[PDB]
């Protein structure tokens, strides 16, 4: 109950939230059913609309005018964005030629840059070229300050998990806003867009940029517009704020626009009545800056412009029914549309079971635009996993495509031409970034990069210290002119060792055979030198990467590769290879097929064996240096090493041996040689982090070797590709992928055929960031360059996609 008969008079937008039975204010009261009696009457009028004309210059103050064009109204902060072009002959913020701002230009009392952040949902990235001619302010914006052509939205690329993001630096699994939809069961809750549930405090994690700001005692306005305000009274109302006395102005800000988005689902991403919807916001971006001048205060606060994702075609007829599919379809819940999660719709069924549905979801139709997958198994890249809101049961739905349960839900709810929601690697999702500002640099591009990243920078940019979040601070430092965050590389927390020959092959029982016994002063020296580190600056070109958890392991050299061993899980974490352009694929040789040799740096008691492999039916075993590429018949010989041997199912040695034997070596003749890093990752509890061994759920039947849940590899080359990888000056270029290790190729429908026409789409499909790779194995790479370290975490952060332009 709101007592709503207290008044809002001087009080319009009050910053500071009443509790009720007061009545509020504020611009959320709306939404609460809270607002006082008098709200719309004083606090949204709208007499005489939203700009200056030639008679109401120097006017006679009348207040219950929306904007004023009176002489008082520079020092009321409150004249219509226009007034000063039309009744002082000034000029548009958009006619001006763009000058530098090398330093801000603040009036006095300015303790520092205010940051308004301009946030447009459905914003496409693509809008930025096509849509130039009609949103002439944006492109000032753009051109002027420092733009990227396109920003990265997370998955699900929703409007509150990415708006939530922006605001925290963290993964929707981590924020907890986890689509447009979910049901907590440990709240026994569900959350929607419609109604009042999604206003309860629980459903919010992590610390958004507005709490950031408080507890450091930086003011911010509100980042929540009620639906019916409309968009010139929150610039106005924000044009306000920016007047108020030193000691009560906030220093950051948000406007919200609901369009394009609101549009584009009516009508598709490039529908011909998606133009008046794009000059629109281009001219709230008019009045905000025409604002911004009149105060002022255009070469002082830094904007913000970027958008929450994009917007795909979509209509009723590309729907995929589940009714088509599963007999049980009652037995279920769907969250249905761009991406669907599937649970039980009644906990005391015990005879529901995911398996069989996943089975009877998987590959049943020539076309299938979508894809079943436990929330485990999805793309690293997606952190899409850890989160009880998220169902055990996934499905990614193919652009342009809707999945529901039957028939009867799509026409009983063609409303609709556009929708988002999709995988966040599709072009169509893509959305923008553009900054300008004192903080800023000038006409200044920047490589794409992803939402998660600009918490840290929007810190950076009010010197707040950020809370813990999934950015990597010093990542988008070439953004920044100034205030830019000086990172330091982690300590190494383990040191390795080093071992020489200790062991005689007799103390080795590992069920392990070798045909190897047959038979220099020239090349035992030789051979000596390999194993003491000869090579090594071949092999290992940005130095060894530091572990950052204590552990105990042992660098190991050899003639092709190098390589990180851990004495705990029986295993390397690290092997490091270069393959130059001119190098070349042999095979492994028929008196070497089952071959594994002892390691005599390193105790039987921590190697593997291979007589786990043997009773065990279902794992297999490879290698992480591939005997394919050994430089000579002699050092193939070091490939057969047990402690370069790791557990693989034999329906993965098929993905791993082609990318082995075939696609490195491809790489390496396209990008001018190329370093390899390799290794097993284990995630059992699907958290994005490396597991303790005490997380480990499988071993290898009836030993202490675990299995690993998931294969990377980091394939460097020089950016500059006419310098070979082992020889490169600048930048450098890098791609990676963290491949599932699963028992079966069920997620590739067409892996019944050659390898050649599967296997790289499904490595394409889990490409990661260096960064991801960290964080799964508490590695850190990259660690003896001679790039910026600033660089080094662009490069970490860089996502290879494999779309188009
Ligand atoms: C992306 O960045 C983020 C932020 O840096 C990373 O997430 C962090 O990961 C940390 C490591 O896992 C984690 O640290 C844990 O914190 C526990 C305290 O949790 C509270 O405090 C934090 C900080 O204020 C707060 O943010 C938490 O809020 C979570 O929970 C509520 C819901 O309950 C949500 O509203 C909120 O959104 C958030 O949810 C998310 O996080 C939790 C995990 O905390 C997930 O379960 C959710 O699914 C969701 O993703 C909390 O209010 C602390 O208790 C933990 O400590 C245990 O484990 C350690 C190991 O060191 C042990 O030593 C401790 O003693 C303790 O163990 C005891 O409890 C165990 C579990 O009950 C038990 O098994 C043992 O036997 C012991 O008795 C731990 O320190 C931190 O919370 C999150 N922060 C956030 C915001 O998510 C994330 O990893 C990054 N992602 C990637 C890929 O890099
Ligand atoms: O992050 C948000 N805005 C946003 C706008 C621009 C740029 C980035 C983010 C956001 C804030 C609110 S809230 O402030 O009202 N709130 C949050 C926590 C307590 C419950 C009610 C709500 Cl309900 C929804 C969103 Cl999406
Ligand atoms: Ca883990
Ligand atoms: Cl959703
Ligand atoms: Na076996
Ligand atoms: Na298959
Ligand atoms: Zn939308």
Not at 193 to 211: A, C, S, T, V
Not at 502 to 514: A, I, K, P, V
Not at 585 to 594: A, G, K, R
Not at 719 to 743: E, M, N, W, Y
Request: with cysteine.
């Amino acid at each position: 109950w709101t007592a709503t008969s207290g008044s809002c008079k001087g009080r319009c937008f009050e910053l500071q939230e009443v509790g009720p039975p007061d009545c509020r204010c504020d611009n959320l009261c709306k939404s609460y059913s809270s607002c006082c009696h008098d709200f719309d009457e004083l606090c949204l009028k709208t007499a005489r609309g939203w700009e200056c004309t030639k008679d109401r210059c120097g006017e006679v103050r009348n207040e219950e005018n929306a904007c004023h064009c009176s002489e008082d109204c520079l020092s009321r902060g409150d004249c219509c964005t226009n007034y000063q072009v039309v009744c002082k002959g000034e000029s548009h913020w958009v006619d001006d030629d763009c000058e530098e701002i090398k330093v801000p230009e603040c009036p006095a009392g300015f303790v520092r840059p205010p940051l308004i952040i301009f946030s447009v949902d459905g914003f496409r990235a693509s809008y930025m070229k096509k849509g130039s001619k009609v949103m002439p302010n944006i492109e000032k914006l753009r051109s002027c300050g420092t733009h990227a052509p396109y920003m990265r939205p997370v998955y699900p690329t929703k409007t509150f998990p990415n708006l939530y993001t922006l605001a925290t630096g963290l993964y929707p699994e981590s924020h907890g806003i986890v689509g447009n939809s979910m049901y907590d069961p440990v709240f026994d809750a569900s959350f929607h867009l419609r109604g009042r549930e999604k206003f309860n405090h629980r459903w919010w994690g992590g610390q958004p940029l507005w709490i950031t700001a408080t507890k450091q005692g930086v003011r911010a306005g509100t980042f929540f517009w009620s639906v019916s305000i409309p968009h010139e009274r929150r610039i106005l109302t924000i044009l306000q704020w920016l007047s108020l006395p030193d000691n009560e102005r906030p220093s950051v800000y948000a406007f919200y626009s609901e369009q394009p988005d609101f549009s584009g689902h009516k009508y598709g991403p490039f529908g011909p009545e998606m133009t008046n919807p794009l000059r629109e916001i281009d001219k709230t971006v008019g009045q905000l800056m025409d604002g911004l001048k009149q105060l002022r205060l255009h070469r002082c606060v830094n904007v913000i412009f970027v958008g929450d994702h994009g917007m795909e075609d979509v209509t009723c007829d590309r729907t995929e029914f589940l009714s088509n599919y599963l007999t049980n379809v009652d037995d279920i819940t769907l969250v249905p549309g761009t991406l669907g999660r599937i649970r039980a719709k009644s906990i005391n069924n015990s005879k529901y079971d995911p398996k069989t549905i996943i089975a009877a979801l998987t590959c049943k139709k020539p076309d299938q635009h979508f894809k079943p997958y436990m929330k485990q198994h999805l793309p690293k890249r997606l952190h899409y996993a850890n989160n009880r809101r998220i169902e055990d049961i996934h499905l990614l739905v193919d652009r342009r495509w809707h999945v529901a349960r039957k028939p009867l839900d799509v026409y009983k709810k063609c409303f609709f031409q556009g929708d988002h929601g999709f995988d966040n690697k599709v072009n169509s999702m893509q959305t923008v970034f553009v900054g300008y500002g004192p903080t800023f640099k000038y006409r200044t591009k920047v490589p794409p990069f992803e939402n998660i990243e600009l918490y840290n920078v929007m810190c950076d940019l009010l010197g707040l210290k950020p809370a813990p979040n999934n950015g990597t601070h010093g990542s988008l430092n070439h953004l920044l002119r100034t205030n830019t965050f000086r990172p330091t590389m982690p300590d190494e927390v383990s040191r390795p060792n080093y071992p020489g020959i200790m062991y005689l092959q007799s103390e080795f029982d590992l069920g392990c055979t070798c045909d190897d016994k047959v038979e220099n002063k020239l090349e035992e020296l030789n051979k000596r030198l390999h194993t003491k580190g000869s090579t090594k600056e071949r092999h290992l070109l940005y130095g060894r990467p530091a572990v950052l958890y204590r552990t105990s392991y042992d660098i190991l050299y050899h003639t092709d590769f190098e390589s990180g061993y851990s004495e705990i899980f029986l295993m390397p974490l690290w092997t490091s290879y270069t393959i130059s352009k001119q190098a070349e694929v042999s095979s492994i040789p028929e008196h070497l097929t089952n071959c594994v040799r002892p390691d005599v740096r390193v105790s039987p008691g921590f190697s593997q064996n291979c007589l786990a492999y043997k009773n065990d039916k279902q794992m297999s075993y490879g290698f992480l240096f591939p005997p394919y590429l050994s430089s000579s018949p002699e050092a193939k010989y070091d490939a057969f090493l047990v402690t370069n041997m790791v557990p693989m199912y034999p329906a993965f040695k098929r993905v791993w041996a082609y990318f082995q034997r075939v696609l490195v070596k491809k790489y390496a003749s396209e990008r001018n040689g190329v370093n390899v890093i390799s290794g097993p990752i284990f995630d059992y509890n699907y958290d994005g982090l490396r597991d303790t061994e005490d997380e480990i759920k499988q071993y290898v039947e009836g030993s202490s070797i675990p299995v690993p849940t998931h294969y990377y590899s980091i394939i460097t080359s020089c950016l500059d590709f006419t310098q070979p990888a082992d020889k490169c000056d600048g930048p450098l270029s890098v791609s990676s992928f963290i491949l599932p290790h699963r028992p079966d190729n069920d997620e590739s429908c067409n892996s019944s055929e050659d390898e050649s026409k599967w296997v790289e789409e499904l490595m394409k499909m889990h490409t990661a960031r260096v960064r991801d790779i960290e964080h799964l194995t508490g590695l850190d790479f990259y660690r003896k360059t001679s790039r910026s370290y600033s660089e080094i975490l662009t490069l970490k952060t860089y996502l290879h996609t494999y779309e188009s332009e």
